[PDB]
């Protein structure tokens, strides 16, 4: 039972009252930023050793961008965290009306395989920066990323302020069954859907980062070459294991053709002629994964026009096109969350947008068009958790840009100041003094309705 | 099955975009507010009869403000609702960066039975600012109100844009099993958690307006007269039937008996001697709920100081103040939501919090104090949804004020720009031009490391 201990104890550090204070928060942000600097050697091993990803890979998507968020946090925390003036109107004068920012107090975060280090430590940054205490679950199928994530903060903090908890799925059902303040969770549309009727059972608030399958909208007026750079870069970062990659393409039947050239030319350009040999390519998580993916192969063999080699001693799946793909195929009807990209062709945008219409409300949405219209179209009539114009993946790197889904693909939303504001309740307060007295609000009322009612009817 | 068929035609007529152009939101949000001042008598009429409200509270709570936040949400809604230019840092350039505000598409709202118009038209407001549409169901406790609301609604509006749905909990449980894009529900505790785990069933995201019981401090440097009078208006108004409505009192062992000769003198000031003659105060909405305070009326006759009587056939139940109340108390086991108001004595500021900590987190919470100190105690130490110095009731009146609980007593918020917020989902979306090529932060990635390093610890 020491999972319920370890989250009791950790109600009971919350309860002394120490985490609200400011310049507590900001000594634990400083402490996090120092610890991961002493293990940012081990770090990169972990994520080399169970993703393949390469230290350039890795700094920029998981240990350099936690540093720069750390680093942000701590230094407008005084802004984010100070109680608001709020503008009170006239009718209500002499009341003074006031924001408080206060801590939920202990929060859950649970954290999937494919950025195992970002996806624990920038939900941390807000749940500290909010005031909070926090347990951590961390993905086991990266277990050497899992057990550095341990060793970090069991040598940095205790256990009663941030803990971090390894194992499976019953470990998970554990934690989301115990009453905590909060539940922040990435991963899966299955475990998300477990998470959030647990919770429900316990009226606990919570934020899911889920998936689907985000489509890219390549019309007849894209830049084709710039469109392929854009689109392999945000598609083969992680090996495809990411939830707002380029899951499939809708290109218009005009320049499928040009698309395939270019995509495969990217693709060269890239990683080179043997892409197994390229040292900025990744790799599959596990082998159960890699064998869903090359089943998937199997099943588009037929399509493919660019890549399908694969290695089962690497988990190494080669970055793979497939074209004539329909609604029918294998490679469609699941989040792919790997390094193969069907290529679908459409007539006219309206046909587009009423294919990605007929299926779930997905995590990103991607346009690649000169036509300022069309652009319009595609924001005002397609609703998903975020995306880009003549990109792909880089609206994450604002952290000026809230970050979530919609629909199936999730609910709530973080990077920078929105981390803190999910682990903060807002609570409103008035201040009205005592010496200014008046009896025109209230009872008796008599002859006061012409009063009341001009009031609200001018 | 016309609730479900009455679902997907809202659903299908939300797919036909007409309900994202602003022109339709700001015409429809017209029509609104003429179409409550034509019913404003029968409004009038069916909050006096379901509830015995008279006319100058129901103009302050459910008429008056309703047109009030209709009439802003009008005025601002090109404000709220155009596309944020967000900004880029340097890193990013060119990229530019934007937030769209979009609809989650046909949300459902429901209502209970004490503020029966404002519950249900508040929450609507925010819906079609937003761009949605929307099935409500309101309290069918108060049935001339429902039919009121049912009778504007269907004269003002298709069927499939707004749509009321009359029934008891039935009816609310065939709304919550369908697949909603968006559930707000103001109601009771137990009630929330049914609406909270059909809605995770279906990853359908939720506002929960919910209950508890809001504690008032009263410690020994207050104004205890002018508290006394802030304390009655916050309670009796609706005849205590609110959810921010003083529950209890922990009130300093100095000035108990001094606060209680106030609140008594107050209570004749407000409503007289024969206060079930008093024009100004209200009655019990129906008999179940009658008894169930009749009930809590006769386990605590011994220590009624003040009141305690009640007329059955009006539905009347008096003010009534009671006096050496304890944990134990059968008033201090559920929230009372009417006109008793127990007071519980304490002899230090600790206990007063280590009683109210003790608890769910209330949904409002009250301090009458001069002390400074003693304010900045009990806002940093003590969680609860928004509350009041020196005043109660009054944090909701501010529309800048975000108004929702905590915990037990809720999760998200509304009034004014927040409930446009409920009912929105910010996208945010990227821009970068194909004009402008770079290869730097492309594969091969040979040689970059120190670069990125770099820039992610300077």
């Given at each position: ?79 984010w965290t100070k109680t608001k003036?709020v ?10 009306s006031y924001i408080k920012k206060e801590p939920y ?25 909010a005031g ?50 909060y ?22 608030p ?211 100041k929105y981390?803190f504001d999910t682990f903060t309740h807002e609570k409103s307060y ?29």
């Amino acid at each position: 039972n020491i999972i319920e201990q370890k989250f009791y104890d950790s109600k009971a550090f919350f309860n002394t009252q120490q985490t609200k204070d400011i310049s507590f928060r900001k000594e634990q942000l400083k402490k996090l930023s120092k610890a991961i600097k002493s293990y940012e050697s081990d770090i990169l091993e972990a994520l080399y050793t169970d993703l393949g990803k390469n230290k350039v890979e890795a700094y920029a998507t998981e240990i350099g961008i936690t540093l720069k968020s750390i680093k942000i946090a701590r230094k407008e925390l005084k802004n984010w965290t100070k109680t608001k003036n709020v503008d009170t109107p006239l009718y209500l004068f002499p009341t003074k009306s006031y924001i408080k920012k206060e801590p939920y107090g202990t929060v859950l975060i649970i954290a999937p395989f494919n950025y195992p280090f970002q996806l624990v430590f920038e939900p941390l940054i807000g749940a500290i920066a909010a005031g909070n205490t926090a347990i951590i679950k961390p993905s086991e199928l990266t277990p050497n990323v899992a057990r550095v994530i341990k060793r970090l903060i069991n040598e940095t903090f205790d256990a009663n302020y941030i803990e971090v908890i390894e194992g499976g799925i019953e470990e998970t059902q554990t934690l989301i069954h115990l009453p905590f303040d909060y539940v922040f969770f990435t991963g899966s549309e299955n475990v998300g859907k477990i998470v959030y009727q647990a919770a429900s059972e316990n009226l606990v608030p919570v934020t899911l980062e889920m998936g689907g399958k985000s489509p890219v909208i390549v019309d007849e007026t894209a830049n084709i070459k710039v469109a392929s750079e854009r689109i392999c870069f945000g598609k083969f970062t992680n090996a495809g294991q990411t939830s707002v990659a380029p899951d499939y393409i809708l290109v218009h039947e005009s320049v499928k053709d040009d698309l395939i050239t270019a995509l495969s030319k990217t693709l060269r350009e890239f990683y080179g002629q043997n892409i197994q040999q390229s040292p900025d390519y990744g790799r599959i998580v596990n082998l159960k994964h890699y064998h869903r993916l090359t089943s998937l192969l199997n099943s588009a063999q037929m399509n493919i026009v660019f890549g399908g080699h694969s290695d089962e001693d690497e988990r190494y799946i080669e970055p793979t096109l497939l074209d004539h793909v329909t609604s029918d195929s294998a490679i469609m009807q699941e989040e792919i969350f790997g390094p193969i990209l069907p290529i679908l062709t459409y007539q006219s945008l309206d046909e587009a947008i009423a294919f990605i219409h007929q299926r779930p409300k997905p995590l990103s949405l991607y346009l690649f068009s000169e036509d300022e219209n069309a652009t319009q179209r595609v924001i005002n009539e397609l609703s998903f958790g975020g995306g880009a114009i003549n990109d792909t993946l880089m609206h994450l790197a604002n952290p000026k840009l809230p970050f979530g889904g919609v629909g199936a693909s999730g609910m709530g939303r973080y990077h920078g100041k929105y981390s803190f504001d999910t682990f903060t309740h807002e609570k409103s307060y008035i201040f009205k003094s005592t010496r200014l007295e008046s009896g025109v609000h209230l009872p008796p009322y008599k002859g006061k309705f012409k009063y009341i009612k001009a009031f609200f009817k001018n």
